[PDB]
Structure formats: structure tokens, C-alpha cells
């Protein structure tokens, strides 16, 4: 019952029974070792405190959002300017002839 209690405290039984994974303990332990090695490598590559990571998850995402918005805007502006310049060159050649 203590294991049940701490399990439902970590994750509800309904949220953990919906997944379809094998029930053998060896593959579970191997996947746990793999994900621990992966998170250790991720922490050695780059990592900060939990609150800093949570704040960055929004700060840098808004940074990338505004950056890609400005990127799309300047891209469509450049495309419109390019086709307008092509039409202007065509009209200039027509006026020249």
C-alpha cells in the first residue's frame, strides 16, 4: 500500500495504465538506465536550475517566435520587392523601346 501511495503521488494509476509497454523487469531496468545516461549526458552538455530551465522554456521560445515572425515578414517583403522590381524592369524595357 505504501508503494501504491507513492506511485499515485508520482503519477495516477489511470495515467500509467494507458501506456502499452512490456511488463518484464529487465527491460524496464534497462530503459531506466538508458534514460538516466541520456539525462546525464544532457546535463553535462548544458543545464541550469529547474526554475531557470522553466523560465527559459518560455523566454527562449518567445525569442524564437518573434525571430521567426520577423523572418517570415522580411522574407515575404523581399519576395514582393523582387517581383515588383522584375515587373518594374519589364515596364522600363517597354517604355525604353
Amino acid at each position: 500500500q505504501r508503494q501504491i501511495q507513492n506511485a499515485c503521488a508520482f503519477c495516477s494509476k489511470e495515467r500509467i495504465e494507458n501506456v502499452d509497454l512490456p511488463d518484464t523487469q529487465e527491460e524496464i531496468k534497462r530503459e531506466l538506465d538508458k534514460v538516466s545516461r541520456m539525462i546525464q549526458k544532457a546535463e553535462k552538455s548544458l543545464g541550469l536550475s529547474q526554475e531557470e530551465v522553466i523560465a527559459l522554456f518560455e523566454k527562449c521560445r518567445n525569442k524564437y517566435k518573434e525571430g521567426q515572425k520577423k523572418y517570415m515578414e522580411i522574407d515575404e517583403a523581399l519576395n514582393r520587392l523582387h517581383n515588383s522590381l522584375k515587373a518594374r524592369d519589364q515596364n522600363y524595357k517597354n517604355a525604353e523601346k
Partner: protein
Amino acid sequence: SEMHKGRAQVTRTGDIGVAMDNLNAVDSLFNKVIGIKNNGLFAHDARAMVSISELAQISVRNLKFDDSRSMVNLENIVNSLKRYMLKEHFKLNNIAENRND
């Protein structure tokens, strides 16, 4: 004249949608011009497009590198060093630029 008077607002608010509407109106006017030759408006079109391009390429660099942290790079330094406008606009053109965003 509208572009010359609104470039300051475009730089302050940072919204380039005004320049996009200007480009759309320019394209529409050129479409109505298509069919009859008119070389007088080509110089104005070139001036408008060069002003829009330089304003965009300068505001991109002058924009904040981060969402919250305003990176004070060398560009901001040379901008704050060349912010004196005592005669070139206040006395040469007798115009007072706004100081509110």
C-alpha cells in the same frame, strides 16, 4: 510625406506592418500604372523602397537580441553617442521629433 513622417513611429513601435501596407499600396499603384508609361513615379518608388529596406535592416540590428534582456552592444553605444540633434533637425528643418513611444 506620409512615409517621411511615419518612419519615426515605425522605428519606435517596431511594427513593420506600416511598411508592408506601404509596399502593398505601391504595388497596387504600379498595377494601375501598368499599360501607360510613367517615369516620374519611378524615382519616388526607388526612394520609398530604399528607405524601407534600410529602416528594416537597421531596426533588425537595433532590436533587442533577447525578449527581456536588452543587449547594449556597440550599435547602441554609437547610437547613444550620435544622438545629438540640436541643429540638423531642431534648427535646420525647425522640426521637433517626439520623445514618446
